[PDB]
Structures are given as C-alpha cells and as structure tokens.
Amino acid sequence: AQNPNCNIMIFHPTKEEFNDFDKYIAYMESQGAHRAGLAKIIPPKEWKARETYDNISEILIATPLQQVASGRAGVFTQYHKKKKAMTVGEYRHLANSKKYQTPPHQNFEDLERKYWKNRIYNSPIYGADISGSLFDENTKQWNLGHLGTIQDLLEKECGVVIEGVNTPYLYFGMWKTTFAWHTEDMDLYSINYLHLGEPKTWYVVPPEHGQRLERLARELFPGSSRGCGAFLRHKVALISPTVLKENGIPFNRITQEAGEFMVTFPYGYHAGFNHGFNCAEAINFATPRWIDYGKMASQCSCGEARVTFSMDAFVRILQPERYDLWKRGQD
C-alpha cells in the first residue's frame, strides 16, 4: 500500500502533466496521496491563474462574517455574526489595520503558536463563500471555474441525469480567520487555490481515521453531540493540535502559500487558519472513487447545516433512505 503512514504529499507536475486534471488526480491517488486526506500541488513554473490581481478591489463581500469564539484556547466553537457589506478594497484595509493585522513573528511555527494561544480572544472577519472566480477565462489548466461538474460525474458513473450546478467560491481571509473541522458536503473532494496574499495553515485527519476525530468531538462538544448526530457538518468546532495529540488522534499539518493548490480527499477532515490578508478560491469535485463515500456520508438533519440546492439530488440519488428526513432538516 502506498503512503501507509498517511503523510501529506506534495506534487510538482510538469506543464505536460498539468493538462489533464482527472488523470493527475488519479496519479496522485496511485501514489497514496488520498491517505493523508490532503495534498499540495505546486503548479508548473510556466502556469499562471491570471495576469495580475490589480483590479479585484471592487468585488463585494455582501455578508462578511465576524467569527466569535467560545470555549477554551484549544477547544472552542465559533459563531458567525453577519456584518455590513464591504468591498474587497475595504476588507483588505481592515485586515491591515492595527486591530486585525498579523502580529510580528519569527516564522510559521511561531505564528501557529500565537494562533492557538490567542485565537479565542479576537473575532476576525471572514469574507467566505462568495460565488465567483478569479481565474482568467484563458487559463486552460486547473481553472477551478472550468472543471467538470459533480452532476456530470454522477451521470457518467451512475447513468442518472440530475439537476444542479457546481461553481466556485471565493474566500477573503485575514489573520486568525478560521475554518472549523469538517469534511466536504457529501464527503466530496475539494480543491483550493490560494490566489494571493498571506498563507493558510491546514490540519487534516486521514480518512481512514475520521471516526476517531468524530468520537473525540462528541466527547469535547457533548451538548452539540446530543443535538445532532453529525454536528461537525455545522462547521463550528475547533480542536487544537495539542489537544488532538493529547488524545492520540492521527493528523498532519501543512502551510499553503500563494500560488499553490490544495486538494482535500473524500472524508478527509480538515481545519485551519489564515496568516493575514489573502484570497482563496475553492470548489468541490468528484471522481469515480468518491461515489462510495457519497453513499456513506453522514448528514445533518437537525437543520443547522443548511446547504446548497445541488446537494438535494446527491442525497436523493445516493441516499434515498435518508432523503425524507434530511429534507425535513433542509425545509
């Protein structure tokens, strides 16, 4: 078996190998990359997502989210308080202000220490889940707006045509902005490109060990656990690397820098934080190996997790037994 210790692998495709997305994902998996739950792909040196980022300031963040923490430094939840709309220009100015800017630090490790020590005492503002793309329409390789759709994948594998579309989202981050522990909707893959700015640190649990993370989460967030049998779908719980180590949860960490792709694999729990002002783009995707994960994905039916139009069809076709109850939560 390749990559038996489930280490995060880093890939360096040639421009030639960068031409066929599906084939390269399949190549990564042949080398065991999926075992980690997360891989990094450094694009060929000749590749660019677009010519410049000079004209992005007028993108609107219609609902910036202030991420308010509760709990203890290593074990907390976060809630999103909706803020008034602002442009990316305004947001970047806010990110750079004395109140929100990245503190002085030695290196990524020092900044990670300061994150876990101090996150809970600040409420950074996250421009998340903004439908759109920063890829130039003339970028032909690994253009997150031109991937094949999950609906087409299901049709090709399963022969059923379904409604739904699949489009990317932009994330504008600042220091301490945080993504809670989660897998993707329907345990899909995700791909994330860091277009610009400061890094993003990721933590990930190997898919083969996800249930160990879930078990610890139920012990650490016991009221959440009683409220819903899949509360990590709410995307609100944080658990520090220290706490995961204390409880013997296998995980890995890696820092993504501007110009790099990350791929999360089905049922790879991940969480992380942004180092400073940045802009990422991400989209879910599927492969034939995903199908079985989609069939087994947990679902939130308590009504908190409230997800996209397109997830309906996935649950309807892959999880017909769940469908009724899950849709009661959706409506």
Ligand X SMILES: O=C(O)CNC(=O)C(=O)O
Question: Residue ranges for the binding site?
Answer: 126, 182, 184, 192, 200, 228, 234-235, 270, 300, 302
Q: Binder to ligand X among 76, 91, 100, 171 (CB under 6 A)?
A: 171
- Per the structure block, which two tokens stand in for 168? 């990317």
Does position 264 bind ligand X by CB under 6 A? yes
Does position 181 bind ligand X by CB under 6 A? no
Q: Binder to ligand X among 282, 286, 305, 318 (CB under 6 A)?
A: 282
CB of 146 to Ni ion, least distance (A): 20
Q: Binding string to Mg ion for residues 137 to 176, with x set by CB under 5 A, is what? A: ----------------------------------------
The DSSP bridge pattern shows strands 65-72 and 252-256 to be unpaired
Q: How many CB atoms lie within 10 A of CB 316?
A: 17
Q: Which is nearer to ligand X, 143 or 192 (CB)?
A: 192
75 class by beta-carbon count within 10 Å (0-12 exposed, 13-18 middle, 19+ buried): middle
CB of 182 to Zn ion, least distance (A): 12
Residues 28-87 that bind Mg ion (CB under 5 A): 56, 58
Does position 304 bind Zn ion by CB under 5 A? yes
CB of 283 to ligand X, least distance (A): 8
- Per the structure block, which two tokens stand in for 23? 């084939």
The site that binds ligand X (CB under 6 A) totals a number of residues, namely 8
Instruction: Give the relative orientation of helices 311-318 and 320-330 as an angle to the nearest 10 degrees.
Output: 150
Q: Binder to ligand X among 179, 221, 285, 314 (CB under 6 A)?
A: 179
Cβ contact 250:318 at 8 Å: no
CB of 282 to ligand X, least distance (A): 4
DSSP state of 112: H
226 class by beta-carbon count within 10 Å (0-12 exposed, 13-18 middle, 19+ buried): exposed
Q: Binding string to Zn ion for residues 214 to 253, with x set by CB under 5 A, is what? A: --------------x-------------------------
- The helix or strand, by DSSP H or E, that contains position 271, with its residue range, turns out to be strand 269-274
Cβ contact 280:190 at 8 Å: no
Does position 261 bind ligand X by CB under 6 A? no
CA pair distance 8, 30, nearest whole angstrom: 14
Q: How many CB atoms lie within 10 A of CB 174?
A: 27
In DSSP notation, 277-296 reads SEEEEEEEE--TTHHHHHHH
For the annotated binding site for Fe cation, the residues are: 182, 184, 270
CA pair distance 176, 277, nearest whole angstrom: 10
Binding footprint of Mg ion on the chain (CB under 5 A): 56, 58
Binding footprint of Ni ion on the chain (CB under 5 A): 190
Binding footprint of ligand X on the chain (CB under 6 A): 171, 179, 190, 192, 264, 270, 280, 282
Binding footprint of Zn ion on the chain (CB under 5 A): 228, 300, 302, 304
